[PDB]
């Protein structure tokens, strides 16, 4: 039961330095909690374009979330979520980059705005997809609904709407209550 998990994180211009860091901290928190397990990780920043900040092979080598994310540079551009999810599916979940054949694939998408592009995420549909939408851009129910298409079903399970970046701590608290030895 191997799990290959990718964090796909928003690096758009809307994000303040502390908000961007809170996103990184949440990613680190999850990885640290799941150290020395069947989980292996990759992280991809997305804005207008995409950057694999570290891949699965990097994670195996270092096993240190602080070191792996120490040299991330905030892109400060747009929010091309469709393109980003497609990039993960076709350019990140790859054996060449340390992905394990037949592993359970998981995506955690973290964003603070509506997608600035369009299309489909068919290429990523076999990945278990969570999306975390954070902050004032997701005030309306309408804006929150736009995230449903990116996530696995039902949205009640896979879509998390947080009013503040501080709430990432509370989300991590909740997530950990779902951790079991099987």
Q: Which residues bind Mg ion (CB under 5 A)?
A: 12, 14, 112-113
Asked whether the beta carbons of 65 and 25 are under 8 A apart, the reply is no
The one of ligand 1HV, Mg ion, none whose footprint includes residue 161, by CB under 5 to 8 A per kind, is none
Contacts of 141 by beta carbon, 8 Å cutoff, 6+ apart: none
Q: Smaller CB distance to ligand 1HV: residue 78 or 135? A: 135
Asked whether the beta carbons of 79 and 40 are under 8 A apart, the reply is no
> Shortest distance, CB of residue 85 to ligand 1HV, whole angstroms?
15
The one of Mg ion, ligand 1HV, none whose footprint includes residue 14, by CB under 5 to 8 A per kind, is Mg ion
The one of Mg ion, ligand 1HV, none whose footprint includes residue 106, by CB under 5 to 8 A per kind, is ligand 1HV
Q: Smaller CB distance to Mg ion: residue 65 or 135? A: 135
Residue with tokens 């995420």: 121
Binding site residues, ligand 1HV, CB under 6 A? 3, 104, 106, 108, 128, 130, 132, 160, 171, 174-175, 178
> Shortest distance, CB of residue 14 to Mg ion, whole angstroms?
3
Which sign does the torsion angle of CA 127, 94, 161, 63 carry?
Answer: positive
The one of ligand 1HV, Mg ion, none whose footprint includes residue 174, by CB under 5 to 8 A per kind, is ligand 1HV
Residue ranges of alpha helices (H) inside the chain are: 17-33, 56-62, 65-68, 81-87, 141-145, 155-158, 167-176
What size, in residues, is the chain?
A: 182
> Shortest distance, CB of residue 108 to ligand 1HV, whole angstroms?
5
Asked whether the beta carbons of 85 and 124 are under 8 A apart, the reply is yes
> Shortest distance, CB of residue 128 to ligand 1HV, whole angstroms?
6
151: nearest Cα among 159, 143, 141, 162: 159
> Shortest distance, CB of residue 40 to Mg ion, whole angstroms?
28
The one of Mg ion, ligand 1HV, none whose footprint includes residue 128, by CB under 5 to 8 A per kind, is ligand 1HV
Q: Smaller CB distance to ligand 1HV: residue 123 or 175? A: 175
CA distance 169 to 171: 5
């Amino acid at each position: 039961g191997n799990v290959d998990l990718v964090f796909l994180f928003d690096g758009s211009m809307s994000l303040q330095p502390d908000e961007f860091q809170k996103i990184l901290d949440f990613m680190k928190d999850v990885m640290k909690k799941l150290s020395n397990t069947s989980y292996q990780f990759a992280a991809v920043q997305f804005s207008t374009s995409y950057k694999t900040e570290f891949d699965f092979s990097d994670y195996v080598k270092w096993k240190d979330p602080d070191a792996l994310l120490k040299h991330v540079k905030h892109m400060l551009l747009l929010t091309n979520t469709f393109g980003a999810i497609n990039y993960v599916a076709t350019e990140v979940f790859r054996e060449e980059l340390g992905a394990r054949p037949d592993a359970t694939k998981v995506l955690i998408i973290i964003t603070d705005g509506e997608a600035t592009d369009s299309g489909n995420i068919d290429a990523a549909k076999d990945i278990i997809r969570y999306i975390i939408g954070i902050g004032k851009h997701f005030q309306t129910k309408e804006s929150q609904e736009t995230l449903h298409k990116f996530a696995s079903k039902p949205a009640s399970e896979f879509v998390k709407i947080l009013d503040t970046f501080e709430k990432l701590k509370d989300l991590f608290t909740e997530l950990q209550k779902k951790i079991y030895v099987i």
